[PDB]
């Protein structure tokens, strides 16, 4: 069982962990931890954070769609 997939990191989230953040734009979004939520606020682009699943796919280190 999973809670979902983290918006910023790309990481799958275990049941009973993480949090949803809801913006006034009306969108609901899931984050793995406080670490990656804060990186969003500070406008760090995910592709530069080299341990993320997003970054690894973009570089072609991991096979993706």
């Amino acid at each position: 069982f999973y809670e979902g997939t983290c918006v910023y990191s790309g990481y799958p989230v275990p049941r009973g962990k993480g949090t949803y953040f809801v913006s006034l734009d009306d969108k609901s979004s899931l984050f793995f931890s406080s670490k990656y939520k804060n990186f969003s606020d500070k406008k760090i682009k995910a592709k530069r954070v080299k341990q993320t699943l997003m970054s690894k796919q973009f570089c072609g280190k991991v096979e993706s769609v």
């Binding site: 275990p14 009973g16 931890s33």
Partner: protein
């Protein structure tokens, strides 16, 4: 003059004086009422605290008067504690007699062969002994002293209890070579039946499945975590004083009036906190199982043991039988606890409901645990 505004007291006087417990192992001091109408059964056991995890269960509990047509079912997430319970071994019995001064012990009778683990409790320092402990007692079997002893117990007794020890050698993480010994009461039938039932079982092993089953309510007796000497702010919960005060803010400001000219026992003072005996009533058994047989739910079709990835932090892996119970339990990992059948049955609706599990969490307790098995980790990373 009367004080300006009303407020409640700080802390409960039901637990004063709050002194330190004498030793770490508790005796069950009170047992539920006997009933001659039922078969002979045991009333308690010993267990070791492993650690905590969480589960998801299905529920359908709602007000009987709620007008909603549909049989609504809902997921609930709950925290649980795991206890390890290897089989205890029976090694003797005691009879008691009722007097104007309460119960008094008449005689104690021991098995012919006793184990190294139990003899080790009788000496103080383990590695320095001549081991001439019980070596002359076996003659009493030849002499018929045992047969005279049983006669006296059977003739003159009101209450009968067995002596049992735990097999510490099965739990290596304890670093312990002396067994723990507990006296457990027998309820049901007559004195004669109780004595015969006991005699049949000296030297043998009783599994936990004799005493308890799933969904049962039980009482847990233990000693809490220790916290050393502490001030009034933490020991009794009193408020911190004004920020600009000299001579300290973390204290009770006024400790009495002029008369009486002494301090009352009801005022808060600094001292020992933690390491006290406490009993938790009516906790419910969610599951019973074994540390090395995998299990599954109707919904989670993975097959896994209770052990999380990397084990419980300062314990490792469960190997013997285990019980799982709702909520938190006294003391740190590795402490001994006493389990008892509930003293009286509960009327509350939250207690008497069924339990149906759909998921149990097995992720790592060190750091953020993000996989349920080694197969998932090997699949997420390469190769």
């Amino acid at each position: 003059s009367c004080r300006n505004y009303s407020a409640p007291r700080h802390g409960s006087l039901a637990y004063c004086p709050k002194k330190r417990a004498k030793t770490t192992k508790p005796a069950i001091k009170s047992f539920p009422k006997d009933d001659a109408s039922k078969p002979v059964h045991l009333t308690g056991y010993l267990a070791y605290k492993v650690g905590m995890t969480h589960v998801v269960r299905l529920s359908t509990r709602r007000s009987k008067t709620e007008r909603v047509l549909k049989e609504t079912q809902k997921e609930v997430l709950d925290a649980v504690t795991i206890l390890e319970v290897p089989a205890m071994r029976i090694f003797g019995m005691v009879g008691y007699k009722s007097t104007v001064n309460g119960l008094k012990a008449i005689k104690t009778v021991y098995a012919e062969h006793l184990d190294e683990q139990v003899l080790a409790r009788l000496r103080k320092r383990n590695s320095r002994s001549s081991k001439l402990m019980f070596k002359l007692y076996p003659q009493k079997y030849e002499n018929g002293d045992i047969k005279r002893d049983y006669e006296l117990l059977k003739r003159e007794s009101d209450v009968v209890r067995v002596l049992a020890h735990t097999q510490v050698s099965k739990i290596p993480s304890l670093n312990l070579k002396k067994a723990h010994i507990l006296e457990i009461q027998l309820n049901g039938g007559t004195i004669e039946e109780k004595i015969e039932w006991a005699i049949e079982r000296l030297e043998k092993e009783i599994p936990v499945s004799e005493v308890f089953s799933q969904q049962d309510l039980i009482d847990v007796i233990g000693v809490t975590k220790g916290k050393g000497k502490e001030g009034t702010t933490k020991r009794f919960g009193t408020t911190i004083l004004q920020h600009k005060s000299r001579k300290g803010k973390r204290k009770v400001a006024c400790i009495g009036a002029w008369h009486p000219a002494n301090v009352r026992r009801t005022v808060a003072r600094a001292g020992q906190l933690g390491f006290h005996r406490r009993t938790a009533q009516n906790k419910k058994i969610y599951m019973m199982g074994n540390g090395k047989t995998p299990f599954s739910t109707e919904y989670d079709l993975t097959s896994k043991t209770i052990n999380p990835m990397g084990g419980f932090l300062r314990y490792g892996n469960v190997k013997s039988d285990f019980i799982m119970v709702k909520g938190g339990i006294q003391g740190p990992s590795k402490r001994v606890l006493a389990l008892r059948k509930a003293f009286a049955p509960s009327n509350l609706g939250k207690d008497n409901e069924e339990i149906v599990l759909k998921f149990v969490d097995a992720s790592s307790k060190k750091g953020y645990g993000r996989f349920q098995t080694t197969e998932e980790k090997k699949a997420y990373f390469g190769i």
